[PDB]
Amino acid sequence: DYIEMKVPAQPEYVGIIRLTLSGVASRMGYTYDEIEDLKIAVSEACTNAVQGEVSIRFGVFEDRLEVIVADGLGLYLMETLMDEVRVQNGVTVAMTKYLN
Amino acid sequence: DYIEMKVPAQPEYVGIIRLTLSGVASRMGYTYDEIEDLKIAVSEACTNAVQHAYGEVSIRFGVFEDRLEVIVADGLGLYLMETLMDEVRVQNHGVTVAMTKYLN
Amino acid sequence: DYIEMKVPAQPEYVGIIRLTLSGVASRMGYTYDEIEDLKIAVSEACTNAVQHAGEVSIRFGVFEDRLEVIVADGLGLYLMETLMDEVRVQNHGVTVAMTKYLN
Amino acid sequence: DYIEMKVPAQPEYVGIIRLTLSGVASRMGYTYDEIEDLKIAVSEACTNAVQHAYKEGEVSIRFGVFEDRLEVIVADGLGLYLMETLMDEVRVQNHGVTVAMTKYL
Amino acid sequence: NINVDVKQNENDIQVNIAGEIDVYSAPVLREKLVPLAEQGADLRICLKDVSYMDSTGLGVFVGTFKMVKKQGGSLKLENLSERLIRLFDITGLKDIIDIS
Amino acid sequence: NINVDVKQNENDIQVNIAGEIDVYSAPVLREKLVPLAEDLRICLKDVSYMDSTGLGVFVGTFKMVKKQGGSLKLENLSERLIRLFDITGLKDIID
Amino acid sequence: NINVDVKQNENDIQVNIAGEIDVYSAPVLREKLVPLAEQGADLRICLKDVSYMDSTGLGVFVGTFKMVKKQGGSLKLENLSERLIRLFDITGLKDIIDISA
Amino acid sequence: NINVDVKQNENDIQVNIAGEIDVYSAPVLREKLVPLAEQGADLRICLKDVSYMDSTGLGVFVGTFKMVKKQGGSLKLENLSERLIRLFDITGLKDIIDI
């Protein structure tokens, strides 16, 4: 349920994060279209996060995937592509997406 | 520079680690054969972790300027690890596996 | 410009037809979505051909504006006709001619 | 079983041949390394044909799929070297040229 | 070619298809999937890793929907790539065969 | 990580981009495409991933193209990618 | 993440395995192959489409080898990658289990 | 096709080649990298993403080696698949060209 990753706060690693996410999401049944959408969203969160170290927490529940990023052009993208987004203020991003 | 991960000690989640590792080794510049070797070795470490746990498993990839250092913590495989990698050490009290493969 | 293929009238070889078609279509500029649509349509023509007989002849005419595929010796016709920009049929064996204008 | 293709003596169509061969190669059951060698050899023969018909074309290629071996025939100095070393048997005849090679499973 | 993976749990059969469903391989799928259908199971078929399909796959599938209804089962299709639902729609076949 | 292929013929530039446009690569793309902006055709057939940073360098170079009178076309865009341009409402503006 | 396709005709069984064979997936593979080995039949298992393999797969394969020998049958593994044949070699299982490409 | 990405910093210029290098695409590669040989600065060519290469690809590579040597520069190739190195070795080019 609890997945954790820590990357240096540098751009290079968003791909790595996307990669792990693609993995977690692939095990769900999240269709390829969905997993691509998820990469967009999580990469947006991580990109704003770097812009040090970056902490990413995947919570894999029954029907819900929860991504948590911690230490403006994009935020629209997150909200539209995802089902629920929150913020806290240091910055922390919250993300959740339902099943189709 | 280092990467850190924590995963539930369940078999399902070993692939996730394989993917991260594969990404890192490709980014660093290892041969195809070498990156496949890393997948075998680190997956073997994690396999022993899951089996000898049941739990949860911690992994730290250290990407050094010229070598990858893998650290797994919470027997054909141990031969496989020791064979495919350049240096492996083990310590227990719970076990921690450290393995490094040189970039060339 | 004209590419021509001849394969045994066997189902195994319809994949090969698709593979060459994907190549020919890729060089031209067709989108991935368009090239998959092309494979479904060309593959339906060839399926009817194998289930007809043998050997199956396929001729790709690669033009400036269009790709024209001609294959020779109810569910499927709709697919060809819907996915292609023009579909034509003739008898006596069978010949399917289809064109898709790349836009 | 035989496969036949005819392409304009143009460089762009050389890629098409490798591609088709690749399918024909994998279906009959060659190694990855064998299928990659096959692409090199067939593509070199086709390069030779295009560069010949350059001066004055059409190029015909026929894949013969047998139980033990794949027989490639292309018709209209390094490259012939690659052809000869990467294949199991190579024959050449004029006339332009018709190059024949076989690779065994 | 094609890969057909049948897993039967809780008197419920789950087939995973991977590969091409065309004129060549559809007889294989008919042979594999018709003895499962003509014994009124509830079938779930995954087309997540199907890379290609044309009307021959649709034909084999409607035949198995028929035998499922005749012998008293269900038929569900799941994790379909964007293109496959598009084919089931344009073919006017989504009207009856399940999709998810 | 990313590959940008420029061909300059007839005061007309054709760029083919293949790879990922994320936070890591978008500075590289901006730095490559800015000497061209300050008539462009860009091919994204082989772009595998893009987020807000790619669109950001694109909007900057589109602004640069309108300011210097040139052209800007985007072509062979994947249906999923073009749909992304719709959701951001940029299909109407930049093709 | 794995596809095991068994086609059985007249005591000759052809399994095609596609995907990844590790600690998560190996139980699935054993469940598929063990009733088949216990049949004394002739297994032909195609490893053309295996994307990954480690000792856990090797274990299910040596177990299937013993199970087939124990019940009076045969076992052949076919169309293996250069790298997979190297994996079977490293462990000295190339010696025990018939293998080809 | 082919994608050729040239980056020139302080005359330490790196080409990244991705795709197929055949009779069709090798002229394009030569056209792109010949002005690079003329300044004859230290260039490194990365064939990490080369999917196919033929004698026509070897031909543009030897043409660029000669042209780089004439203007006083260097030529490095890296990194090549074990299979690409074998392709260079069989042609008796492994000894002459850097890798």
How many domains is chain E built from? 1
Please answer whether residues C4 and C58 qualify as being in contact, where contact means their C-beta atoms are separated by less than 8 angstroms: yes
**What is the crossing angle of helices B76-84 and B32-51, to 10°?**
150
Subunit contact A50:F56, Cβ cutoff 8 A: no
The residues that bridge with A67 in the sheet, in sequence order, are A58, A95
Residue type for position H27: P
Q: Write out chain B residues lying below 8 Å of A6, CB-based.
A: 2-5
Q: Which residue has the tokens 């990839």?
A: B61
Please answer whether residues D58 and H39 qualify as being in contact, where contact means their C-beta atoms are separated by less than 8 angstroms: no
Residues D83 and D86: their CA atoms lie apart, in Å, by 5
Resolution in A: 3.4
Residues D15 and D12: their CA atoms lie apart, in Å, by 6
Buried b (16+ CB within 10 A) or exposed e, D14-34: bbbbbbbbbbbbbebebbeeb
For residue F9, whether the previous peptide bond is cis, meaning omega lies within 30 degrees of 0, is: no
What is the least distance, in Å, from the CA of G40 to any CA of chain B?
Answer: 27
What are G59's two structure tokens? Answer: 């274990």
Residues B45 and B96: their CA atoms lie apart, in Å, by 9
For residue D95, whether the previous peptide bond is cis, meaning omega lies within 30 degrees of 0, is: yes
Residues H52 and H2: their CA atoms lie apart, in Å, by 10
CA B85 to chain centre: 10
Residues G10 and F33: their CA atoms lie apart, in Å, by 65
What is the least distance, in Å, from the CA of B35 to any CA of chain H?
Answer: 13
Q: Which chains touch E (3 or more CB pairs under 8 A)?
A: A, C, G
CA F60 to chain centre: 10
- Tell me phi and psi for residue G23, to 5 degrees: -65, -35
Q: Output the 3-class SS for chain E.
A: CEEEEEEEECCEEEEEEEEEECCCCHHHHHHHHHHHHCCCCEEEEEEEEEEEECHHHHHHHHHHHHHHHHCCCEEEEECCCHHHHHHHHHCCCCCCCCCC
The DSSP symbol for B9 reads S
Residues A20 and B20: their CA atoms lie apart, in Å, by 6
Closest CA to F49 of D50, D38, B5, A38: A38
Residues D24 and D14: their CA atoms lie apart, in Å, by 16
Subunit contact D14:H59, Cβ cutoff 8 A: no
What are A66's two structure tokens? Answer: 């929860």
A75 close to B (CB below 8 A): no
**Following DSSP, what letter does each residue of F9-77 receive, concatenated?**
ETTEEEEEEEEEESTTTHHHHHHHHHHHH--EEEEEEEEEEE-HHHHHHHHHHHHHHHHHT--EEEES-
Buried b (16+ CB within 10 A) or exposed e, B3-36: bbbebbbbbbbbbbbbbbbbbbbeebebeeebbb
Q: Which residue has the tokens 């005419």?
A: C61
Residues A75 and H6: their CA atoms lie apart, in Å, by 34
**Following DSSP, what letter does each residue of A46-79 receive, concatenated?**
HHHHH--EEEEEEEE-SS-EEEEEE---SHHHHH
What is the least distance, in Å, from the CA of C1 to any CA of chain E?
Answer: 28
How many domains is chain B built from? 1
Residues H48 and B38: their CA atoms lie apart, in Å, by 19
Judged by 3 or more CB pairs under 8 A, whether E touches B is no
The DSSP symbol for C13 reads G
Residues F74 and F58: their CA atoms lie apart, in Å, by 10
For residue H79, whether the previous peptide bond is cis, meaning omega lies within 30 degrees of 0, is: yes
Size of interface A-B (CB pairs under 8 A): 53
3-class SS of residue C51: coil
Subunit contact E23:C43, Cβ cutoff 8 A: yes
C29 close to D (CB below 8 A): no
Q: What is the number of other CB atoms lying within 10 angstroms of the CB of residue C62? A: 18
Subunit contact H82:B31, Cβ cutoff 8 A: yes
**Distances from the Cα of A90 to the Cαs of A58, A70, A96, E92, in angstroms?**
20, 8, 21, 54
Please answer whether residues F94 and F62 qualify as being in contact, where contact means their C-beta atoms are separated by less than 8 angstroms: yes
**With breaks defined as C to next N over 2.5 Å, after which residues does chain A break?**
51, 71, 89
The residues that bridge with H50 in the sheet, in sequence order, are H19
Judged by 3 or more CB pairs under 8 A, whether C touches E is yes
Interface test with C, best of F45, F47, F74, F95 (most C CBs within 10 A): F45
What is the least distance, in Å, from the CA of D79 to any CA of chain H?
Answer: 6
Q: Write out chain B residues lying below 8 Å of H50, CB-based.
A: none
CA F51 to chain centre: 12
Please answer whether residues D35 and D26 qualify as being in contact, where contact means their C-beta atoms are separated by less than 8 angstroms: yes
- Tell me phi and psi for residue B98, to 5 degrees: -125, 130
Report the relative pairing of strands D89-93 and D69-75 from DSSP bridges.
unpaired
Please answer whether residues C3 and C41 qualify as being in contact, where contact means their C-beta atoms are separated by less than 8 angstroms: no
Beta-carbon contacts of G67 under 8 Å, excluding residues fewer than 6 positions away, are G34, G37, G38
Residues G46 and G30: their CA atoms lie apart, in Å, by 15
Residues C18 and C36: their CA atoms lie apart, in Å, by 9
How many alpha carbons fall within 13 Å on the CB side of residue G54? Answer: 32
Subunit contact A33:E80, Cβ cutoff 8 A: no
Q: What is the number of other CB atoms lying within 10 angstroms of the CB of residue B93? A: 5
What does the longest C-alpha to C-alpha distance in chain D come to? 39
Please answer whether residues F29 and F35 qualify as being in contact, where contact means their C-beta atoms are separated by less than 8 angstroms: no
Q: Which residue has the tokens 């000869």?
A: D84
Please answer whether residues C46 and C14 qualify as being in contact, where contact means their C-beta atoms are separated by less than 8 angstroms: yes
> What part of G 8-37 touches E (C-beta under 8 Å)?
16, 18
Closest CA to H6 of A13, F15, F49, A10: F15
Please answer whether residues B37 and A40 qualify as being in contact, where contact means their C-beta atoms are separated by less than 8 angstroms: no
Query: Domain containing F11 — which CATH number?
Result: 3.30.750.24
Subunit contact C76:E83, Cβ cutoff 8 A: no
Phi-psi group of H52: left, alpha or beta (phi > 0 → left; psi -120 to 50 → alpha; rest → beta): beta
Three-point CA angle H75, H76, H82, nearest 5°: 140
Virtual CA dihedral for B49, B53, B58, B62, nearest 10 degrees? Answer: -20
Evaluate whether residue F44 is within a structural domain: yes
Q: Write out chain B residues lying below 8 Å of H79, CB-based.
A: 29
Please answer whether residues D24 and C16 qualify as being in contact, where contact means their C-beta atoms are separated by less than 8 angstroms: yes
Q: Which residue of H has its CA nearest to B30?
A: H79
Method used to obtain the model: X-ray
Evaluate whether residue F94 is within a structural domain: no
E100 close to G (CB below 8 A): no
Q: Output the 3-class SS for chain G.
A: CEEEEEEEECCEEEEEEEEEECCCCHHHHHHHHHHHHCCCCEEEEEEEEEEEECHHHHHHHHHHHHHHHHCCCEEEEECCCHHHHHHHHHCCCCCCCCECC
Residues C90 and C45: their CA atoms lie apart, in Å, by 12
Closest CA to F65 of F43, F41, F40: F40
Q: Which residue of D has its CA nearest to G80?
A: D31
Beta-carbon contacts of B19 under 8 Å, excluding residues fewer than 6 positions away, are A19, A20, A22, A23
Q: Write out chain E residues lying below 8 Å of C33, CB-based.
A: 83
Domain that holds residue F15: 2-88
What are B15's two structure tokens? Answer: 């692939």
Residue type for position D18: R
What is the least distance, in Å, from the CA of H70 to any CA of chain B?
Answer: 31
Subunit contact A1:B8, Cβ cutoff 8 A: yes
3-class SS of residue B82: helix
Please answer whether residues A47 and A11 qualify as being in contact, where contact means their C-beta atoms are separated by less than 8 angstroms: yes
Evaluate whether residue G36 is within a structural domain: yes
Closest CA to B3 of B32, B30, B24: B24
Residues F85 and F79: their CA atoms lie apart, in Å, by 10
Closest CA to H31 of B53, G53, F6: F6
Closest CA to C40 of E21, E47, E92, E78: E21
Query: Domain containing B56 — which CATH number?
Result: 3.30.565.10
Sheet holding E2-9, edge to edge: E2-9, E12-21, E42-53, E74-78
Please answer whether residues A45 and A69 qualify as being in contact, where contact means their C-beta atoms are separated by less than 8 angstroms: yes
